[PDB]
């Protein structure tokens, strides 16, 4: 009945091994607001948890696109890309994160 | 109860934004096995979520120390450090992760 | 007609044989101790796996009403409801369970 409740429900479903249903509900949560970076990150984390790494990368990329100066999102995307063997992209986003950290340092 | 079930309870709480109690459950889970990097990382992130940045960095440093060449762990530590304004450290570990990715390539 | 007998038999039937007969003897086991939440739980699980969702939900609701402070029972009920399409009810019972988990800490 709300984004948060559908997300938590999806999480509970995932814990009990109900992968398909979990993804279904998490996708509903995203559908209520497709531009919510938090929900997108949650869905990407669920998809990655269920071995669907490419979709996870897709939604992480969208989350990045919505706010590209987000060090955390960049790092997560980079880790996912690295795990899947996409070295150049991973190093790219990690270097972006480094650049932002540098900006904060100065 | 087991480490897995404790972690599940803790995550159910963490998803609700209830970091304070979730940290209690995760502390139990970590107590059952102090060298589990998964549980250590989860506890660290929960502590950062609650607002205990330095202690989070501590547990993350332990997680790193147990398996120093792990890209995910390194990146996570880098993020936690960057959140606390410790730029040089963060960039250092991030660069370490980068070099590992490059080595794998 | 002991509970050990009935459960041994039901398990023997479900493990390799008819799910229906196993359900029969699980019903017998439940009738033996209607306040036994483990028997109700097993019955609900078997009924669910056989495709009898509403019935599973019935016995799980019964189990819940038998011990309202049981986290596992509430979680499983919420799972069955969410799987059945009842998102509001499921979210309600998840909320009860989570409230219990939280209270058990603080």
Numbering used by the authors:
A (entry chain A), C (entry chain C): 1 to 106
B (entry chain B): 1 to 105
What does the study report here?
One of these highly populated repetitive folds is the αα-solenoid (SCOP a.118), whose most widespread superfamily is the tetratricopeptide repeat (TPR; a.118.8). The ﬁrst crystal structure of a TPR domain showed that the repeat units are helical hairpins, stacked into a continuous, right-handed superhelical architecture with an inner groove that mediates the interaction with target proteins. Here we show that such hairpins are detectable and that one of them, from the ribosomal protein RPS20, can be customized to yield a TPR fold by repetition, with only a small number of point mutations that are neutral for the parent organism. We concatenated three copies of RPS20-hhta as an initial construct, connected by the TPR consensus loop sequence (DPNN).
When we studied the melting curves, M4N showed cooperative unfolding with a Tm of 77°C, while the unfolding of M2, M4E and M5 did not conform to a classical two-state transition, consistent with an unstable molten globule-like state. We obtained crystals and solved the structure of M4N to a resolution of 2.2 Å. The asymmetric unit (ASU) contains three polypeptide chains of almost identical structure (all pairwise Cα RMSD values below 1.4 Å). Notably, all three chains exhibit the desired TPR architecture with three repetitive hairpins, which interact via knobs-into-holes packing between helices Ai and B(i-1), as is characteristic of TPR hairpins. A superposition to the CTPR3 structure yields Cα RMSD values below 2.6 Å. However, this missing helix is compensated for by a specific dimerization mode of two M4N protomers. Therein, the C-terminal TPR units of the two protomers form a tight interface, in which the B3 helix of each chain substitutes for the stop helix of the other, mimicking the capping effect of the stop helix. Analysis by mass spectrometry revealed that the M4N stop helix had been partially proteolyzed upon expression of the protein.
